[PDB]
Design a protein around this ligand. Sequence first.
Ligand code: NA
Ligand code: NA
Ligand code: NA
Lengths: 174, 174
Amino acid sequence: PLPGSANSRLYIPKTDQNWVVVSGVGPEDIKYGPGWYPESWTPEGMVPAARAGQPGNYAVAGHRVAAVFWDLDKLEEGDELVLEDAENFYTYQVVESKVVLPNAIEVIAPDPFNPESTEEPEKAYLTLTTAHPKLQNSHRLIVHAELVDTRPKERGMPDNIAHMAPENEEGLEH
Amino acid sequence: PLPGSANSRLYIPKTDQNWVVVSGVGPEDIKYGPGWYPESWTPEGMVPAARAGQPGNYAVAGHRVAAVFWDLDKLEEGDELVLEDAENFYTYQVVESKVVLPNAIEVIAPDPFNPESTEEPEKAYLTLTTAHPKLQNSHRLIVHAELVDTRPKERGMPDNIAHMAPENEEGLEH
Ligand code: NA
Ligand code: NA
Ligand code: NA
């Protein structure tokens, strides 16, 4: 189909939250909820970002507001984040939460732990970004997580997100 | 800022319509209005698509419904489309309207009149895509338009879209 792109869903057990993640991080894109950065940063230029569950860095921006990323500071090392595509649930575990300046575009590099890399990535990360401190725009709060499990959707939802029901049965795909 | 991406606005005098164009063409992206295809097709793989007003093919999908692209079939050769970014109004003129099968991904090539090209694009195109016929999903109606004017926003809006007011004063940028 034309178009034939897919969206994803993000689930956070710790804060009991979930969203459909749209494509893009412009102001209209993330007005109402989180959005995926379509390109990753490298020193040689922007490159296509990892799709959900895939090697590289799937990065998501959301506003620091009640219905979105206000409570991102509650995440700690070890906490799970689940990303869903059309085929799988991908469970990532938080490996770092930190504060950076707003120009720290390196945090969306394919390997945020090696942003100067000129190699194709091997590990799959998830990064969440939002304004910080609360009610300020001076910094960004960054959560990085690493993939620990890939579950085919045929096996049903992970127990700890199975109560997070959608409003409709429309797919993440056309 | 992180994020620092921009959205665009699309205006169509003929049908007296305008929208904020989001990034991406997934189902969630275009649920409520038109979205920009982030990548253009080439025989060697997907590449980054033209940004608004720029050489290549800025392509937009929208559903064939009342508040979006139902009336795309009313556009005729010569009709104007205006795309707005943070700096300019870009006026394009329709050069072709055609019907294709949904797998005709060549219509989002950087040069849709030379889709097999391996060269960088020279001309700036705008392409609109929607399902066709009305109340069917079997085909796609494609409108291609070519850039004819670049107006800096300091000069205000083109006369024929100056009545198309927004609901708020939020920028297309963060
Ligand atoms: Na969202
Ligand atoms: Na969007
Ligand atoms: Na839209």
